[PDB]
Amino acid sequence: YSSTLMTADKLGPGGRSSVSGITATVFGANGFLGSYIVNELAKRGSQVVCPFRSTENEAMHLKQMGDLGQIVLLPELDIRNDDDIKRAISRSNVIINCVGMRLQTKNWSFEDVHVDFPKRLAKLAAETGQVQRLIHFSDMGADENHKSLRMRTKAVGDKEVLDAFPDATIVRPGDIVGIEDHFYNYLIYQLTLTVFAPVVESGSNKIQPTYVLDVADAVAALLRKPDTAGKTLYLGGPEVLTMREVYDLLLKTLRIYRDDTVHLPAWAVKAMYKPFDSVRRMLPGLPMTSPLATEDYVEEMLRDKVVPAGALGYADLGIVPQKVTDGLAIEPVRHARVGGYRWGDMSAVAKDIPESVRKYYNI
Amino acid sequence: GYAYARKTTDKDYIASEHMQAFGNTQLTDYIIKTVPKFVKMAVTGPAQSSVLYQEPTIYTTPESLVPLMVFLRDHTNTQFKCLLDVTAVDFPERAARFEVVYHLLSPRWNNRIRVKVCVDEVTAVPTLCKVFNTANWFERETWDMFGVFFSGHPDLRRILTDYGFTGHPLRKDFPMTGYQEVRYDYGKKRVVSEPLELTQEFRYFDFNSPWETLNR
Amino acid sequence: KARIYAPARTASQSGLARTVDFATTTPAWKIEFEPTAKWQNPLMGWTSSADPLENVGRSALV
Amino acid sequence: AKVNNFTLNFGPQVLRLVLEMQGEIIMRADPHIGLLHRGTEKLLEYKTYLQGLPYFDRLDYVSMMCMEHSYVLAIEQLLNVSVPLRGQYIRVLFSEITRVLNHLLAITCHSMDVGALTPFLWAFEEREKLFEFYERVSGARMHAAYFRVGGVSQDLPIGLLRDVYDWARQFASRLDEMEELLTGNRIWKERTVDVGTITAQMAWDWGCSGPILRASGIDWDLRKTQPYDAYGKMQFNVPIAGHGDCYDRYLVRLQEMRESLRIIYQCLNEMPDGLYKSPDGKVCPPSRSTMKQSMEALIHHFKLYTEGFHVPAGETYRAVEAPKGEFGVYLVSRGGNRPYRCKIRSPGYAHLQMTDVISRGAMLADVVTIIGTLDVVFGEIDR
Amino acid sequence: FKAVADVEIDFNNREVLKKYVGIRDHLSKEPGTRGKLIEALTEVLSSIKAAPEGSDYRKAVEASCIYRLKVCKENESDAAIEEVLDAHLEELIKEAKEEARLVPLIAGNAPWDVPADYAVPVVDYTDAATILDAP
Amino acid sequence: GTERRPGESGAWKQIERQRYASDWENDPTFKRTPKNLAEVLDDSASMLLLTDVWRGMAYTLGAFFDKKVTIMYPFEKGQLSPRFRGEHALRRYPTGEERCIACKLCEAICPAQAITIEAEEREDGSRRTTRYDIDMTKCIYCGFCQEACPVDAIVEGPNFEFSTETREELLYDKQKLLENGDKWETEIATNLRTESLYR
Amino acid sequence: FEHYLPMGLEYRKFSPGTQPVKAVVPHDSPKLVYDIKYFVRDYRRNNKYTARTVDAKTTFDFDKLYAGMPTKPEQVKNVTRPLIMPTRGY
Amino acid sequence: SLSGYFSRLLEASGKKSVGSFFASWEFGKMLVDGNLAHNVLVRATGAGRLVGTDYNGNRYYENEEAAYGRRRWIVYKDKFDYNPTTIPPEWHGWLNYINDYNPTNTQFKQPTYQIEASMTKTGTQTCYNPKGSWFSAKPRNWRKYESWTP
Amino acid sequence: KRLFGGAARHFYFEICRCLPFIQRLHKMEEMVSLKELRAIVKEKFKEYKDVKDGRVVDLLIFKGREEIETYLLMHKQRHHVVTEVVEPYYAKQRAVKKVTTNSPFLDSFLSSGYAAIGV
Numbered sequence A: 001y002s003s004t005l006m007t008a009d010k011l012g013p014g015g016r017s018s019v020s021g022i023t024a025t026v027f028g029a030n031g032f033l034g035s036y037i038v039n040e041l042a043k044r045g046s047q048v049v050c051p052f053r054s055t056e057n058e059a060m061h062l063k064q065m066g067d068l069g070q071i072v073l074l075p076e077l078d079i080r081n082d083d084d085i086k087r088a089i090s091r092s093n094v095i096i097n098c099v100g101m102r103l104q105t106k107n108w109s110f111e112d113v114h115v116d117f118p119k120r121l122a123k124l125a126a127e128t129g130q131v132q133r134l135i136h137f138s139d140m141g142a143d144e145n146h147k148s149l150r151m152r153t154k155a156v157g158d159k160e161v162l163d164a165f166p167d168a169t170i171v172r173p174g175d176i177v178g179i180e181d182h183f184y185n186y187l188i189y190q191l192t193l194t195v196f197a198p199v200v201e202s203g204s205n206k207i208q209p210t211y212v213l214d215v216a217d218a219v220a221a222l223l224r225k226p227d228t229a230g231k232t233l234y235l236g237g238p239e240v241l242t243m244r245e246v247y248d249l250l251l252k253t254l255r256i257y258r259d260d261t262v263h264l265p266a267w268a269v270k271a272m273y274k275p276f277d278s279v280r281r282m283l284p285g286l287p288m289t290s291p292l293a294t295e296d297y298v299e300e301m302l303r304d305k306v307v308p309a310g311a312l313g314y315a316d317l318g319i320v321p322q323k324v325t326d327g328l329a330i331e332p333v334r335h336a337r338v339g340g341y342r343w344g345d346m347s348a349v350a351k352d353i354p355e356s357v358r359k360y361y362n363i
Numbered sequence B: 001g002y003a004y005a006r007k008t009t010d011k012d013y014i015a016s017e018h019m020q021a022f023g024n025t026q027l028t029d030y031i032i033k034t035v036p037k038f039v040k041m042a043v044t045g046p047a048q049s050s051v052l053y054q055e056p057t058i059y060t061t062p063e064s065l066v067p068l069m070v071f072l073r074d075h076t077n078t079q080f081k082c083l084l085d086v087t088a089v090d091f092p093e094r095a096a097r098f099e100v101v102y103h104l105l106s107p108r109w110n111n112r113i114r115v116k117v118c119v120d121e122v123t124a125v126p127t128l129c130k131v132f133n134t135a136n137w138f139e140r141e142t143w144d145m146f147g148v149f150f151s152g153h154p155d156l157r158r159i160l161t162d163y164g165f166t167g168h169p170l171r172k173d174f175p176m177t178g179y180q181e182v183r184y185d186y187g188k189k190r191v192v193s194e195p196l197e198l199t200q201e202f203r204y205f206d207f208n209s210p211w212e213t214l215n216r
Numbered sequence C: 001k002a003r004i005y006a007p008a009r010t011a012s013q014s015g016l017a018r019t020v021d022f023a024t025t026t027p028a029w030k031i032e033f034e035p036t037a038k039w040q041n042p043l044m045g046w047t048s049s050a051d052p053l054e055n056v057g058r059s060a061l062v
Numbered sequence D: 001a002k003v004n005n006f007t008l009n010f011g012p013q014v015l016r017l018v019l020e021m022q023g024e025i026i027m028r029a030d031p032h033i034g035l036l037h038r039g040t041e042k043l044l045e046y047k048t049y050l051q052g053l054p055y056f057d058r059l060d061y062v063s064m065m066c067m068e069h070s071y072v073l074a075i076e077q078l079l080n081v082s083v084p085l086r087g088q089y090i091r092v093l094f095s096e097i098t099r100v101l102n103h104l105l106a107i108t109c110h111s112m113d114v115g116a117l118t119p120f121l122w123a124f125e126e127r128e129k130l131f132e133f134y135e136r137v138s139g140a141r142m143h144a145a146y147f148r149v150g151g152v153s154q155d156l157p158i159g160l161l162r163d164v165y166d167w168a169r170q171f172a173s174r175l176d177e178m179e180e181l182l183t184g185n186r187i188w189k190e191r192t193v194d195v196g197t198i199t200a201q202m203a204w205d206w207g208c209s210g211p212i213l214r215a216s217g218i219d220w221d222l223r224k225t226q227p228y229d230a231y232g233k234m235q236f237n238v239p240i241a242g243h244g245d246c247y248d249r250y251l252v253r254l255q256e257m258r259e260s261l262r263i264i265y266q267c268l269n270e271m272p273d274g275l276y277k278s279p280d281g282k283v284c285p286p287s288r289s290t291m292k293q294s295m296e297a298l299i300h301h302f303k304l305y306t307e308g309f310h311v312p313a314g315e316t317y318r319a320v321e322a323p324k325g326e327f328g329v330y331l332v333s334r335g336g337n338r339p340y341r342c343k344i345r346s347p348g349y350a351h352l353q354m355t356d357v358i359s360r361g362a363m364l365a366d367v368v369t370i371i372g373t374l375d376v377v378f379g380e381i382d383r
Numbered sequence E: 001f002k003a004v005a006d007v008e009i010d011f012n013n014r015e016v017l018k019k020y021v022g023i024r025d026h027l028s029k030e031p032g033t034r035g036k037l038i039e040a041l042t043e044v045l046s047s048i049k050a051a052p053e054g055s056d057y058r059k060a061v062e063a064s065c066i067y068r069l070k071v072c073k074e075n076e077s078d079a080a081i082e083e084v085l086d087a088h089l090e091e092l093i094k095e096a097k098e099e100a101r102l103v104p105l106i107a108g109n110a111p112w113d114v115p116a117d118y119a120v121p122v123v124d125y126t127d128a129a130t131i132l133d134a135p
Numbered sequence F: 001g002t003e004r005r006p007g008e009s010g011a012w013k014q015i016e017r018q019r020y021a022s023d024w025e026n027d028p029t030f031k032r033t034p035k036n037l038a039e040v041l042d043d044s045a046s047m048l049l050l051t052d053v054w055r056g057m058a059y060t061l062g063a064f065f066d067k068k069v070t071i072m073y074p075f076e077k078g079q080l081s082p083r084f085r086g087e088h089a090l091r092r093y094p095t096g097e098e099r100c101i102a103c104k105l106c107e108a109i110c111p112a113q114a115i116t117i118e119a120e121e122r123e124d125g126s127r128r129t130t131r132y133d134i135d136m137t138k139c140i141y142c143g144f145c146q147e148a149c150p151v152d153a154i155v156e157g158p159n160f161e162f163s164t165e166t167r168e169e170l171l172y173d174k175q176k177l178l179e180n181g182d183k184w185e186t187e188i189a190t191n192l193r194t195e196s197l198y199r
Numbered sequence G: 001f002e003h004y005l006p007m008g009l010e011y012r013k014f015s016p017g018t019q020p021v022k023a024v025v026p027h028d029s030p031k032l033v034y035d036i037k038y039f040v041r042d043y044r045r046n047n048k049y050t051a052r053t054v055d056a057k058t059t060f061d062f063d064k065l066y067a068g069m070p071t072k073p074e075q076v077k078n079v080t081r082p083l084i085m086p087t088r089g090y
Numbered sequence H: 001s002l003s004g005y006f007s008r009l010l011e012a013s014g015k016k017s018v019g020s021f022f023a024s025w026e027f028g029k030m031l032v033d034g035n036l037a038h039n040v041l042v043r044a045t046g047a048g049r050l051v052g053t054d055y056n057g058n059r060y061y062e063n064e065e066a067a068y069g070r071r072r073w074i075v076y077k078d079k080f081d082y083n084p085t086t087i088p089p090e091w092h093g094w095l096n097y098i099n100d101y102n103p104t105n106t107q108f109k110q111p112t113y114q115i116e117a118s119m120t121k122t123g124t125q126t127c128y129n130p131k132g133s134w135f136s137a138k139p140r141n142w143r144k145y146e147s148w149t150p
Numbered sequence I: 001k002r003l004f005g006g007a008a009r010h011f012y013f014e015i016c017r018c019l020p021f022i023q024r025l026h027k028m029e030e031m032v033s034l035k036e037l038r039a040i041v042k043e044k045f046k047e048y049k050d051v052k053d054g055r056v057v058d059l060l061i062f063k064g065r066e067e068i069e070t071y072l073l074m075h076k077q078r079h080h081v082v083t084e085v086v087e088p089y090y091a092k093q094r095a096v097k098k099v100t101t102n103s104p105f106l107d108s109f110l111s112s113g114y115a116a117i118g119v
């Protein structure tokens, strides 16, 4: 149980054909973070079971991630049915929950996804007896006294999970950056493609964004260390930034020479977002609706979302988190700049380059 | 540039009697007597051209490969105009483990010949690009597969293997499956090379009889 | 590490062709390496390995 | 002025080409190959001689049995094995069927690259008929593994020659209706006449063979100068042109289809009765009834299907007039049941080396014509 | 051979045959004659004197040239020389010019300069049918 | 026709050569200059007013009104022979006992190493397999295993329509190969009643 | 003009699994059914390689080589093309 | 005769009347699947005769005046999910032109262990899987030794 | 004065001249600097500092040349440089005097029964 999870059945040096001994069930495996977690587990020789609700075309990318027989795909998942949850975890000694929601729909509310399903999942996990680890994902700004509904339902579900499954680990990362993220992508869709970009108040609320590969490494580091069972970890990058600094960094990176943002009082932003929030129910959910066009985002922007003092973070897992503002994490937003990424004139350094290279590049 | 279409009738013959007799019987002695310093060893064996004849194999030093090939191309009795291939054979038991082999065809007199040079891993062989234009890609492939360096080549670079491929695959001490393998990584979003792992390892079947007499 | 040795005659047969008796006629000396880890494939049961020198000394080097 | 060359990358999607242009005129062409290099020469050292035979079907996979032929002949020469008469006739007949298949594909793929789409669809139904002929004798439409050391694998089934004669009775009409769309057409002539000219000295200096060599005025056919199996008995003509043109190669290839039809007709009438396999039981496996009734046959069946025959120590190079030129195998034997070294000589490897000197002075729309008229397949190029 | 052109070509006229196969365009536009063959062979006979008298290379080249000149002398028409030496005369003149060109490179390399006790091992092959089939 | 013209030359060096020199008149494959009025009208009716395009158009219009060679798969099939090498299968005697006796000859001859065999003795003393796998994604469908088998146990049957959606469905074990043989036994026996005259 | 696509029973009238006449395939020669001795036909193991005496002081006479060559169109002799490869009677 | 056409259509479709045929979902799929539409409406109603019927309900027809290789065809009984894997092996060699034998002219020897032909199960979760798979009733660990349990 | 014609330092100078174009083309401006890249390529050269044969030196320089044009012609991308050049160097200089007192033997013992193969 302690460190018998990672040692007792480990066969091979740890590549694609090796065996790690982990059978894991990842809920929400076709999502943004879940795909990276499923890739992290399967590449080391673990069997990963992936139930999903969507069409098979949106889950086909998970089939590549592991050797023959080690990626198991279970379509038509209904999380209101306990039989599907029971079948999906029936051979697993690790359960990882990445199921979450950002907007409400006439079929699904925040309590159904953040409260009721994690409680029933923790109960059915404790019923089996062979599940040695339950990794539940919540947010850094989760709080029971939060005006935003999703943060409050997330904290309530964290309490229910720690109640029903006492050794379950609660993971609370900050904003996650990546190619398919929900943080820079919507901010770039707000800087471009709109007449103006509203900023709540002065934009001085602080955040701690983190990289998706560091969170994927954090899950494996949690599975290694037995002490982290039953704890709560906050995952945040090495830099604390305000939203105005994030907007300035995106405007400098995109090479946009016209600041289209406008600072607005919070009541004005809520008055803008109110007509498309009283009609969010009785509707099956519309494409290209931003998760920033809600009052819950406005309430989140009136507070800090950072790692608390004395909390367990990346350093207790042995991980030095990568920088988010520069390097490989900022390379996808550099592709959306005006004109294209491109190299340059490339002629100052081609002086003492050999003969065929300059003609090959037509310099 | 030979074997122009000259007879407009159907020909029921191959070669003339005197030149075929000379090529099939006297060519080894002729080459040895005319240019003795070029030849170090000769084998007359089972005839590349046909199952019914015999044909010579000439061993030479690398210092005289180019003059011997020029003589074999331009001499009036040995008009070997076509170079069919250049290759190598690895003999790890020898002090010089490589044998570079040149096959030639004479369209003038329906003949063939084989020329060999023995070198180790660090002795260069002179290029035959100026003598034969096909020698370029064959020497590039021989360098790629065996690591034989051909001095004086215009652009000796690998032609067959992968872009970053170090190592010469046709050596006897190189593994059949190699050292690295290739897969797509979802995290790095790139096709990545990794150390080799096999789901089912290769099964080597040792069939060889302890009564068999032909093993050399 | 490598081992240089000439393998003995098999006990099941009486012929001597693959021995050092015919050493000048036939190459008989071998180079062999120590084994590395092997395990079973979970799906089929086939024997898996990560050794690149798994058969190169026993098949090719004489 | 001091005009630098403009370079171009031509296709990852398996030929890669790096051209240089001085406007609309090419100055250089450099083919980058190895995208189909699967290392078959290394893998043949780890097979017995029967085990490594189906590698040769997958070298020139438009012309399979001709690739098998040279490997089989190289083994047979070192083994000192004689092939019986009926097996030699069967080998000649299926070699010519193979040549007809290859030339159909080559001419119609060339004319489709130029822009004519209908001759492709007309010739592939004839290709389907000849694939049915492959399947009826070997059970595989393409990778037959039919030619073996000492003969062929199975006998001809009763009723095959009847249908081969029925196909050959109408094939000349098919070739005739093929030429009505291309031979006397001005667009095809304006695409093919005087494009990529090869003289005789350049053809021999660049190791050319096959229908390239005959279109430059050289009378050289390996089936008439260094004959193998029963090709010396066959009566046929060598077509000769003298410009070294794409148009002349197209005409030579059509005439070679006519001559292959002539050889096929001669083989259908002179097919003898007798053995199709060599009676040396220490090389050729026994029949399945003999194996189930005599002890020596079962022992030879057991040993030939596990250890295989031992080839005596030596070397040879043996070549065949493959439909793309001279295909040769250099076999090196130390004495074992496995080849010590098996070098494969492919004609398309030598033909593709010429693209730097053939495309000079041509335009971008003539590169695909040059590549099509060289008749290249990258399985045999990239071994 | 078979001509792929659908027109009717005579090919008994030898100049038409030399035109059709590309000898005029690709090898030599000037027609080769018996006198040019004699001149080229005498050029070889002059060029070979750079080799030593006792060398087998000089004896080989001289004997080949002497036989070629005897064929040229005993045959007046060029079709007869074509039928004897089994080529076109343009090919034969090119052969003689190439043989004359070869001499300074061989003479610079000096293959005859071996020691007196020079030795070359030769291995010959005997077929099984010599001792198995009927004598 | 295969004749050439000065002007229809596809390149530039020959185009420059034909308009500045009369060397093309010596070549016998060229079309000669017209000599009188009627020949000039024939040449102009060749170049202008096409008539070489029209012959190909008449041929393709004849093909438009001709018969077609398409079969309506899967209601209609192609043509195959009893020697056809399809899906591998394991066979039984008419009693119901397996023919296979674990000789490991088919595993030895397999050039792809697509066969994996383990065996021990059965509880009645018989020599039978405990594992017989065929990796169908490693197989080359040569038929050498069918040739090496001395008891006709492994065959390549007449089935070619066995495409799947997962690759794990193409790693056949012993039970599925016996199920294939039990499915296809009568057809395999009908094929082998003809092919035993030749083999 | 011969038509593509023959109609019914004019091509492949019988399927290969319903051959109308039974086939009797020879697999052995009648000369070897009862005379089975092998060493008289062991061509594989009876070939020889012999090291020649060291080719140093031999006498290559070019006069004999060029004395057997013709000088007139008639008296030219040509080697005929072999009709078949050796079958050894089978 | 159009009466011959309609009688052929009813015997091929398996319906009882033209009103039952044109008001069926089979005609609804034949408006959207043209391969089935051609096979039922043109080929099965043309010149030819019925040969036999297998145990899955498929009908087999032949026409000797047709071209070679288009003499034989099948009308599947499953109109909505037709598949060639439902053809029994005693009809497979006839329909693929391998032999000229079918149950209507040849008595095949039936083994006692013969499994009947049915549609493929690929794409569903009841397909074949190896014994080490997750979808098995009890997955195998293929270890070749026994561990000590205290 | 410099062994075997000083060809090692001439090739090192040629690669150092080629290096900023590699940094621009592979977009490694914010990943590594030219000084550390020069130090890394220098560390590649010291591994064969005890070669006693000039022909081995010539072959090594030819092979290193062919490596540098396969980096110049974009036949290996930035992730190849990451996984083959600079992270092995940073692993060889990062694990020195670790925060744990375990010997290399005990780390190898706890990892697996056999030594690691490759990287």
Ligand SMILES: NC(=O)C1=CN([C@@H]2O[C@H](COP(=O)(O)OP(=O)(O)OC[C@H]3O[C@@H](n4cnc5c(N)ncnc54)[C@H](OP(=O)(O)O)[C@@H]3O)[C@@H](O)[C@H]2O)C=CC1
Pocket (backbone or CB within 6 Å): A027, A028, A029, A030, A031, A032, A033, A034, A052, A053, A054, A077, A079, A098, A099, A100, A101, A108, A113, A137, A138, A139, A140, A172, A173, A174, A175, A176, A177, A182, A183
């Ligand atoms: N920066 C971030 O993104 C942060 C994420 N988190 C939390 O971590 C998790 C990451 O989710 P992320 O991948 O980031 O965003 P996604 O929206 O991509 O994750 C959504 C996943 O949950 C599944 N899902 C949602 N609702 C249901 C439902 N009712 N029934 C079944 N499946 C459902 C989706 O399946 P389908 O695709 O079919 O909808 C998808 O697989 C979430 O819990 C998120 O709140 C924490 C901090 C920040």
Ligand code: SF4
Pocket (backbone or CB within 6 Å): F088, F109, F110, F111, F112, F113, F114, F115, F134, F138, F139, F140, F141, F142, F143, F144, F145, F146, F156
């Ligand atoms: S058919 Fe060929 S590849 Fe398939 S199992 Fe038999 S021998 Fe192996």
Ligand code: SF4
Pocket (backbone or CB within 6 Å): F099, F100, F101, F102, F103, F104, F105, F106, F107, F117, F148, F149, F150, F151, F152, F153, F154
């Ligand atoms: S299938 Fe045949 S060859 Fe293979 S092990 Fe069984 S009995 Fe032997």
